[PDB]
Amino acid sequence: SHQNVLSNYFPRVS
Amino acid sequence: SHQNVLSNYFP
Amino acid sequence: SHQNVLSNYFPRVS
Amino acid sequence: MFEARLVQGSILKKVLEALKDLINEACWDISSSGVNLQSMDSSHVSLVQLTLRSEGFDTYRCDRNLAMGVNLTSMSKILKCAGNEDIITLRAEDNADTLALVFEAPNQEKVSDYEMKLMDLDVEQLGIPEQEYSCVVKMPSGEFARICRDLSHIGDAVVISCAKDGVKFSASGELGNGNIKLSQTSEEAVTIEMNEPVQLTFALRYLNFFTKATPLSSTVTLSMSADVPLVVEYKIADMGHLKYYLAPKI
Amino acid sequence: MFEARLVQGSILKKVLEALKDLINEACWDISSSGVNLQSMDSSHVSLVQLTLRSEGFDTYRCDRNLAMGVNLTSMSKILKCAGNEDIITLRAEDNADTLALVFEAPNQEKVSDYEMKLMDLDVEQLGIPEQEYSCVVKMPSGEFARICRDLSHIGDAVVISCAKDGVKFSASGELGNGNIKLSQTSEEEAVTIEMNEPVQLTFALRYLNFFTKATPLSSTVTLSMSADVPLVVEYKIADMGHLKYYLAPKI
Amino acid sequence: MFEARLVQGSILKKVLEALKDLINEACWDISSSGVNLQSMDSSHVSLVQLTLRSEGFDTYRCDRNLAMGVNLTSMSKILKCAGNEDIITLRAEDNADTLALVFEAPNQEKVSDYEMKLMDLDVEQLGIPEQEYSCVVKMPSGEFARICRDLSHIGDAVVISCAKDGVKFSASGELGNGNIKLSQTSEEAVTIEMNEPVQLTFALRYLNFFTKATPLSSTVTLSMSADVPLVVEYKIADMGHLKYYLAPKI
């Protein structure tokens, strides 16, 4: 198993 | 903030 | 009282 | 001999549902005028008084007065085994060793019969004399129960502030604070008899036990004065009533 | 190859619900006459016999006879995934390694497909001879389920006393003791008694309460008794078969 | 001052119910165009984006834009104290120290008033790019919700397989494996727009959280492409939507 985080796909707009 | 019992009221 | 088993009532049919 | 018969048996089912979480033991005073019960809970913070008048029964007969040690958790367990529509009968003899309970189905092909042991109880008595109340609030019991259930999300204590403006229930906690205001109306009415404004504080834990009597009555009354216990009162129709008493905080 | 099809799948859901808490594994005898299942519970005090006849399925096919080791909880977990109106199909192929369960929804957009592994199970079977019984009671399964639940508040064992026109259930414990008396009525909701000889016996309420898990299968339940023989509690999966529970008496 | 009023308050109750188990804290972006809310879960695998437009309200008013750090369990606890039929009002002032929630009953002889404190949040926001999707599936939200619950009996990951026929949901574990196939129908419809077959894998744990929004919408839409997060979309009728984003496995 391995879980990907949304960081791989979405930019950090803060 | 505090509290008692029901003894202190009734005969 | 004591709990009885069904072995005591039904034969072992194979 | 003691023998009492009640065709709307659900009354008794509801009564012991209203008691059994609060007190484990209580003593039943039987006389020719009916049934009284009084007891405090373990903390001695609250007290409950139950009255059931003779003429609310369909067959009442008492040869002479009795005091019956009853474990109420047990007595509840038994009453759970009564049908919603069963005619329930209570009986006690010379021995007062046991109390007998009879559940007759109205169809007549089922009759249940239970006999429970009566323990022996030390009787720590108090007198709840009826008092005057600065303010007295009448409202639908489900409404009150919902106030109490709601504010338990908020805090551990409710502040009741009653003026003629209407009555307000308040609580505060970690989240923040909450306030519910009821006003006086045109069954489901909210009526307020006020002689003097009061603001008191009560543990919500105890009130939530009281609201277990909710299925007994459409209406509930709250009676308050500064420096006296609150009375939360449910009226059992045509028979009697259930009063819960609670000491304020601070 | 084996394939069986049932348009009202809820039958099969309820059968499982009635089994899985009493027995965890069991063997399914598939033939062309239907399905038999029989097993003791671990304690060997109770037994369960399940019958589901061929003609109660809308499509039954049993080319070769089969004996299928099944974990009944696994099968229960799968069957939770069926709707009560799913058309449920069981299928097993050549080697009988897996059992396939197919759920067709009447919504029609959905066909679910599940396959559980068939374990290999050892066979301690018992032979239940056909008898007739001193006393036999037919009554609403809900009434019975309640009798059993209620008296469990009172004691751990019930004494059933069956006479000419009424049966009495008794239990005792610390609170005190209780007795329930049923009489015969003026169909499904009647209480009827066929008695050749009065019986008074004693049984574990723990086990009966597992039995009543079969309640949603049948409106009516029948109890059969004789002295010195196990009680039989029977629910009928109507038109197809039955679920019989057998229980050994106390003392 | 900021003021939002919603005569059908249940909408908001359902939103909080749809969020509160997935995320504990969040920031509410208040703007004259409506309300936005966005947050990741602690594990950063999923995201939820909430939009509620000005014109879906019965009374919307915003003089200054606001960003409100909110404990969502607290806010849920509060909205539990609202009835399904209550007119709900949100209010914030100049100062923005606390957020006020006002519940008016259709009974209207009762008004509840709650105020929760605004904590301070480092709000790790994300930017949601506009993509187009290989496969896009529309189905009844309860059906999707039952798919997700059913397969949680079997395994911890679901494999969604979309070809032109329909989409297939699959999971495996110790018991065995399960496969659920939906096809397109002749609402309650199932529609599948497929431009190129996809086969993806997601944690069912997260999906079972998403399905908490089922009561908000009769229909749910799923959007997929290889190597972009899954989008689960519920539409709040007339007001906005609730979109969940989930990162695929391996």
Side-chain angles (χ1 to χ4, degrees), chain F residues 123-170:
Chain F
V123 189
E124 180 171 6
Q125 296 275 349
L126 272 60
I128 310 149
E130 87 167 21
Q131 291 134 329
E132 66 183 55
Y133 289 91
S134 303
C135 191
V136 171
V137 190
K138 177 216 135 182
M139 81 179 79
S141 60
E143 192 175 40
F144 178 63
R146 192 183 160 89
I147 309 288
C148 284
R149 169 196 308 146
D150 287 347
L151 291 171
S152 313
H153 297 87
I154 310 311
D156 73 325
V158 54
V159 178
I160 291 150
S161 284
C162 190
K164 200 168 193 298
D165 199 347
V167 60
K168 175 175 72 173
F169 301 81
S170 287

Short mmCIF file of all heavy atoms in Angstrom, two decimals, chain F residues 123-170:
data_model
loop_
_atom_site.label_atom_id
_atom_site.label_comp_id
_atom_site.label_asym_id
_atom_site.label_seq_id
_atom_site.Cartn_x
_atom_site.Cartn_y
_atom_site.Cartn_z
N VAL F 123 -3.93 28.76 7.98
CA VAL F 123 -4.83 28.02 7.10
C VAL F 123 -4.08 27.67 5.85
O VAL F 123 -3.78 28.50 4.98
CB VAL F 123 -6.13 28.78 6.79
CG1 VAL F 123 -7.08 27.83 6.06
CG2 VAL F 123 -6.77 29.23 8.07
N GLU F 124 -3.73 26.39 5.84
CA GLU F 124 -3.02 25.77 4.77
C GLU F 124 -4.05 25.46 3.68
O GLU F 124 -4.76 24.46 3.73
CB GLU F 124 -2.31 24.53 5.31
CG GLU F 124 -1.50 23.71 4.36
CD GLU F 124 -0.70 22.67 5.10
OE1 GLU F 124 -0.90 22.55 6.34
OE2 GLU F 124 0.11 21.97 4.47
N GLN F 125 -4.18 26.44 2.78
CA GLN F 125 -5.08 26.44 1.64
C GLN F 125 -4.37 25.83 0.44
O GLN F 125 -3.14 25.82 0.38
CB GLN F 125 -5.55 27.86 1.31
CG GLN F 125 -6.38 28.55 2.36
CD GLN F 125 -7.84 28.18 2.25
OE1 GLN F 125 -8.25 27.58 1.27
NE2 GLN F 125 -8.64 28.55 3.25
N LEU F 126 -5.16 25.36 -0.51
CA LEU F 126 -4.69 24.80 -1.78
C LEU F 126 -5.45 25.40 -2.94
O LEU F 126 -6.53 25.95 -2.78
CB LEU F 126 -4.84 23.28 -1.81
CG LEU F 126 -3.70 22.42 -1.28
CD1 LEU F 126 -3.39 22.66 0.17
CD2 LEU F 126 -4.09 20.97 -1.47
N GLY F 127 -4.84 25.27 -4.11
CA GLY F 127 -5.33 25.86 -5.33
C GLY F 127 -5.84 24.74 -6.18
O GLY F 127 -5.12 23.78 -6.43
N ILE F 128 -7.10 24.82 -6.55
CA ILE F 128 -7.69 23.79 -7.36
C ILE F 128 -7.75 24.19 -8.82
O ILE F 128 -8.58 24.98 -9.24
CB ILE F 128 -9.06 23.45 -6.83
CG1 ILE F 128 -8.96 23.21 -5.32
CG2 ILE F 128 -9.58 22.22 -7.52
CD1 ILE F 128 -10.19 23.57 -4.53
N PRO F 129 -6.85 23.61 -9.60
CA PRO F 129 -6.73 23.87 -11.03
C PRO F 129 -7.91 23.29 -11.75
O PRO F 129 -8.48 22.28 -11.30
CB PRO F 129 -5.44 23.15 -11.40
CG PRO F 129 -5.34 22.05 -10.44
CD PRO F 129 -6.01 22.48 -9.19
N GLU F 130 -8.23 23.86 -12.90
CA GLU F 130 -9.28 23.33 -13.71
C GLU F 130 -8.68 22.32 -14.62
O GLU F 130 -7.80 22.60 -15.39
CB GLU F 130 -10.03 24.43 -14.44
CG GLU F 130 -9.44 24.82 -15.77
CD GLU F 130 -10.35 25.67 -16.61
OE1 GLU F 130 -11.27 26.30 -16.08
OE2 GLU F 130 -10.13 25.71 -17.81
N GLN F 131 -9.19 21.11 -14.47
CA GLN F 131 -8.80 19.97 -15.30
C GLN F 131 -9.98 19.52 -16.13
O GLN F 131 -11.10 19.95 -15.89
CB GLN F 131 -8.29 18.80 -14.43
CG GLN F 131 -6.96 19.06 -13.76
CD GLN F 131 -6.91 18.68 -12.30
OE1 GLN F 131 -7.90 18.74 -11.58
NE2 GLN F 131 -5.73 18.26 -11.84
N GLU F 132 -9.74 18.68 -17.12
CA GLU F 132 -10.84 17.94 -17.69
C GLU F 132 -10.58 16.48 -17.39
O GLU F 132 -9.46 16.09 -17.10
CB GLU F 132 -11.03 18.23 -19.17
CG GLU F 132 -9.94 17.78 -20.09
CD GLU F 132 -10.24 18.22 -21.51
OE1 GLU F 132 -10.46 19.44 -21.71
OE2 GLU F 132 -10.29 17.36 -22.42
N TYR F 133 -11.62 15.67 -17.46
CA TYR F 133 -11.54 14.35 -16.87
C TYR F 133 -11.84 13.28 -17.88
O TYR F 133 -12.77 13.38 -18.67
CB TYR F 133 -12.49 14.26 -15.67
CG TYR F 133 -12.04 15.07 -14.47
CD1 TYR F 133 -12.44 16.38 -14.30
CD2 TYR F 133 -11.16 14.53 -13.54
CE1 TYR F 133 -12.01 17.12 -13.22
CE2 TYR F 133 -10.72 15.27 -12.46
CZ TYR F 133 -11.15 16.57 -12.31
OH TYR F 133 -10.72 17.31 -11.24
N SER F 134 -10.98 12.27 -17.89
CA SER F 134 -11.16 11.07 -18.68
C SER F 134 -12.56 10.48 -18.53
O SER F 134 -13.21 10.13 -19.51
CB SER F 134 -10.12 10.04 -18.30
OG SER F 134 -8.82 10.57 -18.45
N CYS F 135 -13.01 10.35 -17.29
CA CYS F 135 -14.31 9.74 -17.05
C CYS F 135 -15.08 10.52 -15.98
O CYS F 135 -14.53 10.94 -14.98
CB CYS F 135 -14.11 8.29 -16.64
SG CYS F 135 -15.61 7.29 -16.58
N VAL F 136 -16.38 10.70 -16.21
CA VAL F 136 -17.25 11.46 -15.32
C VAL F 136 -18.57 10.75 -15.12
O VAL F 136 -19.33 10.56 -16.06
CB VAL F 136 -17.52 12.87 -15.88
CG1 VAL F 136 -18.60 13.56 -15.07
CG2 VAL F 136 -16.24 13.69 -15.90
N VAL F 137 -18.85 10.37 -13.88
CA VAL F 137 -20.01 9.55 -13.55
C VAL F 137 -21.05 10.23 -12.65
O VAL F 137 -20.72 10.69 -11.58
CB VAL F 137 -19.56 8.29 -12.85
CG1 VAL F 137 -20.71 7.34 -12.72
CG2 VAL F 137 -18.48 7.65 -13.64
N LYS F 138 -22.30 10.26 -13.09
CA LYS F 138 -23.40 10.80 -12.29
C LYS F 138 -24.36 9.70 -11.85
O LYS F 138 -24.82 8.90 -12.68
CB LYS F 138 -24.19 11.86 -13.04
CG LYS F 138 -25.40 12.40 -12.26
CD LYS F 138 -26.58 12.70 -13.18
CE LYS F 138 -27.92 12.18 -12.63
NZ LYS F 138 -29.05 12.45 -13.57
N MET F 139 -24.71 9.69 -10.57
CA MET F 139 -25.49 8.61 -10.00
C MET F 139 -26.22 9.13 -8.78
O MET F 139 -25.93 10.24 -8.32
CB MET F 139 -24.58 7.41 -9.66
CG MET F 139 -23.79 7.47 -8.35
SD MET F 139 -22.76 5.99 -7.98
CE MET F 139 -21.37 6.31 -9.02
N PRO F 140 -27.25 8.40 -8.32
CA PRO F 140 -27.96 8.70 -7.07
C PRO F 140 -27.02 8.63 -5.88
O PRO F 140 -26.27 7.68 -5.76
CB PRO F 140 -29.02 7.62 -7.01
CG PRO F 140 -29.28 7.32 -8.44
CD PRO F 140 -27.96 7.37 -9.10
N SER F 141 -27.05 9.63 -5.02
CA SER F 141 -26.06 9.76 -3.97
C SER F 141 -26.14 8.66 -2.94
O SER F 141 -25.13 8.29 -2.35
CB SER F 141 -26.20 11.12 -3.30
OG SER F 141 -27.47 11.26 -2.73
N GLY F 142 -27.33 8.13 -2.74
CA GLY F 142 -27.51 7.05 -1.80
C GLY F 142 -26.98 5.76 -2.37
O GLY F 142 -26.48 4.92 -1.66
N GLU F 143 -27.15 5.59 -3.66
CA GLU F 143 -26.58 4.43 -4.32
C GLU F 143 -25.06 4.44 -4.16
O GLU F 143 -24.49 3.44 -3.76
CB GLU F 143 -26.98 4.37 -5.78
CG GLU F 143 -26.66 3.04 -6.41
CD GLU F 143 -27.17 2.93 -7.83
OE1 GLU F 143 -27.06 3.93 -8.57
OE2 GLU F 143 -27.67 1.86 -8.21
N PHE F 144 -24.42 5.57 -4.43
CA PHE F 144 -22.98 5.65 -4.25
C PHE F 144 -22.60 5.40 -2.81
O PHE F 144 -21.63 4.71 -2.54
CB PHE F 144 -22.42 7.01 -4.66
CG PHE F 144 -20.95 7.14 -4.44
CD1 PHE F 144 -20.07 6.33 -5.11
CD2 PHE F 144 -20.45 8.05 -3.56
CE1 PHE F 144 -18.72 6.43 -4.91
CE2 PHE F 144 -19.09 8.16 -3.35
CZ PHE F 144 -18.23 7.34 -4.03
N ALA F 145 -23.36 5.99 -1.90
CA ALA F 145 -23.15 5.77 -0.48
C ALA F 145 -23.29 4.30 -0.08
O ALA F 145 -22.63 3.85 0.84
CB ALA F 145 -24.08 6.61 0.32
N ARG F 146 -24.19 3.56 -0.73
CA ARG F 146 -24.34 2.17 -0.34
C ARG F 146 -23.20 1.33 -0.92
O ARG F 146 -22.68 0.44 -0.25
CB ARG F 146 -25.70 1.60 -0.72
CG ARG F 146 -25.92 0.26 -0.03
CD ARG F 146 -27.21 -0.44 -0.39
NE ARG F 146 -27.10 -1.86 -0.08
CZ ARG F 146 -27.42 -2.39 1.09
NH1 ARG F 146 -27.89 -1.62 2.06
NH2 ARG F 146 -27.30 -3.69 1.30
N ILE F 147 -22.80 1.63 -2.16
CA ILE F 147 -21.61 1.04 -2.76
C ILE F 147 -20.44 1.11 -1.80
O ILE F 147 -19.78 0.12 -1.54
CB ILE F 147 -21.12 1.75 -4.04
CG1 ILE F 147 -22.21 1.99 -5.10
CG2 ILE F 147 -19.96 0.97 -4.63
CD1 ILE F 147 -22.69 0.79 -5.84
N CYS F 148 -20.20 2.30 -1.27
CA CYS F 148 -19.04 2.57 -0.42
C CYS F 148 -19.06 1.87 0.91
O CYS F 148 -18.02 1.55 1.46
CB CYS F 148 -18.91 4.07 -0.19
SG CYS F 148 -18.25 4.95 -1.59
N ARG F 149 -20.25 1.62 1.43
CA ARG F 149 -20.41 1.03 2.74
C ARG F 149 -20.29 -0.46 2.57
O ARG F 149 -19.63 -1.15 3.34
CB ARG F 149 -21.76 1.40 3.33
CG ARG F 149 -22.17 0.66 4.56
CD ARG F 149 -23.66 0.86 4.78
NE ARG F 149 -24.02 2.28 4.76
CZ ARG F 149 -25.17 2.77 4.28
NH1 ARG F 149 -26.09 1.95 3.79
NH2 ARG F 149 -25.39 4.08 4.31
N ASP F 150 -20.91 -0.94 1.50
CA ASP F 150 -20.91 -2.36 1.21
C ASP F 150 -19.48 -2.85 1.06
O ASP F 150 -19.06 -3.78 1.74
CB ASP F 150 -21.74 -2.62 -0.05
CG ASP F 150 -23.23 -2.47 0.20
OD1 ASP F 150 -23.65 -2.41 1.37
OD2 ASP F 150 -23.99 -2.43 -0.79
N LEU F 151 -18.71 -2.22 0.19
CA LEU F 151 -17.33 -2.63 -0.04
C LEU F 151 -16.39 -2.44 1.16
O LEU F 151 -15.31 -2.98 1.18
CB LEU F 151 -16.77 -1.89 -1.24
CG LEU F 151 -17.39 -2.30 -2.57
CD1 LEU F 151 -16.94 -1.37 -3.65
CD2 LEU F 151 -16.94 -3.70 -2.87
N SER F 152 -16.80 -1.66 2.15
CA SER F 152 -15.99 -1.53 3.35
C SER F 152 -16.04 -2.78 4.20
O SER F 152 -15.26 -2.92 5.14
CB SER F 152 -16.42 -0.33 4.17
OG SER F 152 -16.57 0.77 3.30
N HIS F 153 -16.99 -3.67 3.90
CA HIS F 153 -17.06 -4.95 4.59
C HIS F 153 -15.94 -5.84 4.08
O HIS F 153 -15.46 -6.70 4.79
CB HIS F 153 -18.41 -5.66 4.37
CG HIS F 153 -19.62 -4.94 4.93
ND1 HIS F 153 -20.32 -3.99 4.22
CD2 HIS F 153 -20.28 -5.10 6.09
CE1 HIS F 153 -21.34 -3.56 4.94
NE2 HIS F 153 -21.34 -4.22 6.08
N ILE F 154 -15.51 -5.60 2.85
CA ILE F 154 -14.60 -6.50 2.14
C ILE F 154 -13.13 -6.13 2.26
O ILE F 154 -12.29 -6.97 2.60
CB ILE F 154 -14.94 -6.54 0.64
CG1 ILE F 154 -16.43 -6.77 0.41
CG2 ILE F 154 -14.13 -7.57 -0.06
CD1 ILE F 154 -17.01 -7.93 1.18
N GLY F 155 -12.82 -4.87 1.98
CA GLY F 155 -11.45 -4.40 1.94
C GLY F 155 -11.36 -2.92 2.22
O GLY F 155 -12.37 -2.28 2.45
N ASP F 156 -10.15 -2.38 2.20
CA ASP F 156 -9.91 -1.00 2.62
C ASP F 156 -9.70 -0.05 1.45
O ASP F 156 -9.65 1.17 1.61
CB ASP F 156 -8.70 -0.93 3.54
CG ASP F 156 -7.41 -1.13 2.78
OD1 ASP F 156 -7.40 -1.92 1.81
OD2 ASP F 156 -6.41 -0.48 3.15
N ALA F 157 -9.56 -0.63 0.26
CA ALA F 157 -9.39 0.16 -0.94
C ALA F 157 -10.36 -0.31 -2.01
O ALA F 157 -10.63 -1.50 -2.16
CB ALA F 157 -7.97 0.06 -1.42
N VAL F 158 -10.93 0.65 -2.73
CA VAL F 158 -11.82 0.34 -3.83
C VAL F 158 -11.10 0.65 -5.14
O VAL F 158 -10.32 1.59 -5.20
CB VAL F 158 -13.17 1.11 -3.74
CG1 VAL F 158 -12.95 2.58 -3.61
CG2 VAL F 158 -14.05 0.82 -4.93
N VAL F 159 -11.34 -0.16 -6.15
CA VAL F 159 -10.81 0.09 -7.47
C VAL F 159 -11.96 0.51 -8.39
O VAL F 159 -12.88 -0.26 -8.65
CB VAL F 159 -10.09 -1.13 -8.04
CG1 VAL F 159 -9.60 -0.85 -9.43
CG2 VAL F 159 -8.93 -1.48 -7.18
N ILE F 160 -11.92 1.73 -8.87
CA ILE F 160 -12.94 2.19 -9.78
C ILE F 160 -12.48 2.01 -11.22
O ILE F 160 -11.46 2.55 -11.62
CB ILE F 160 -13.30 3.64 -9.49
CG1 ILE F 160 -14.02 3.73 -8.14
CG2 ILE F 160 -14.24 4.17 -10.51
CD1 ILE F 160 -13.82 5.03 -7.40
N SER F 161 -13.24 1.26 -12.00
CA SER F 161 -12.89 0.93 -13.39
C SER F 161 -13.92 1.44 -14.35
O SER F 161 -15.01 0.90 -14.41
CB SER F 161 -12.78 -0.58 -13.59
OG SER F 161 -11.58 -1.10 -13.06
N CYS F 162 -13.60 2.46 -15.13
CA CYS F 162 -14.59 3.01 -16.02
C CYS F 162 -14.25 2.74 -17.50
O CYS F 162 -13.19 3.11 -17.99
CB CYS F 162 -14.74 4.50 -15.74
SG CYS F 162 -16.11 5.32 -16.56
N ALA F 163 -15.15 2.05 -18.18
CA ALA F 163 -15.09 1.90 -19.62
C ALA F 163 -16.43 2.38 -20.13
O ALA F 163 -17.22 2.89 -19.34
CB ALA F 163 -14.82 0.47 -20.01
N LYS F 164 -16.72 2.19 -21.41
CA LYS F 164 -17.93 2.78 -21.93
C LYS F 164 -19.19 2.12 -21.38
O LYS F 164 -20.21 2.79 -21.17
CB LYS F 164 -17.94 2.71 -23.46
CG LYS F 164 -18.90 3.70 -24.06
CD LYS F 164 -18.74 3.86 -25.52
CE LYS F 164 -19.51 5.07 -25.93
NZ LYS F 164 -20.93 4.85 -25.64
N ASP F 165 -19.08 0.83 -21.06
CA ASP F 165 -20.18 0.05 -20.48
C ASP F 165 -20.76 0.66 -19.22
O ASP F 165 -21.98 0.70 -19.00
CB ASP F 165 -19.70 -1.37 -20.15
CG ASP F 165 -20.85 -2.38 -19.99
OD1 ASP F 165 -22.03 -1.96 -19.90
OD2 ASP F 165 -20.57 -3.59 -19.94
N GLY F 166 -19.87 1.20 -18.42
CA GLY F 166 -20.24 1.50 -17.08
C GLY F 166 -19.01 1.38 -16.24
O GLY F 166 -17.95 0.97 -16.71
N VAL F 167 -19.17 1.77 -14.99
CA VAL F 167 -18.11 1.77 -14.02
C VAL F 167 -18.29 0.57 -13.10
O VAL F 167 -19.38 0.12 -12.89
CB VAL F 167 -18.12 3.07 -13.23
CG1 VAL F 167 -19.44 3.22 -12.53
CG2 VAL F 167 -16.99 3.11 -12.25
N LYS F 168 -17.18 0.03 -12.62
CA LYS F 168 -17.17 -1.15 -11.79
C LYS F 168 -16.43 -0.81 -10.53
O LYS F 168 -15.33 -0.29 -10.59
CB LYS F 168 -16.49 -2.30 -12.53
CG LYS F 168 -16.29 -3.57 -11.74
CD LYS F 168 -15.72 -4.66 -12.61
CE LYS F 168 -14.27 -4.40 -12.97
NZ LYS F 168 -13.63 -5.53 -13.69
N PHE F 169 -17.02 -1.08 -9.39
CA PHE F 169 -16.35 -0.80 -8.13
C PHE F 169 -15.90 -2.11 -7.51
O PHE F 169 -16.67 -3.04 -7.41
CB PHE F 169 -17.28 -0.03 -7.18
CG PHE F 169 -17.77 1.28 -7.74
CD1 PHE F 169 -18.83 1.33 -8.62
CD2 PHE F 169 -17.20 2.47 -7.34
CE1 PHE F 169 -19.27 2.53 -9.13
CE2 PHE F 169 -17.66 3.66 -7.83
CZ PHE F 169 -18.68 3.69 -8.73
N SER F 170 -14.63 -2.19 -7.14
CA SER F 170 -14.04 -3.45 -6.69
C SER F 170 -13.20 -3.30 -5.44
O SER F 170 -12.52 -2.30 -5.26
CB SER F 170 -13.19 -4.07 -7.79
OG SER F 170 -14.01 -4.58 -8.81
#
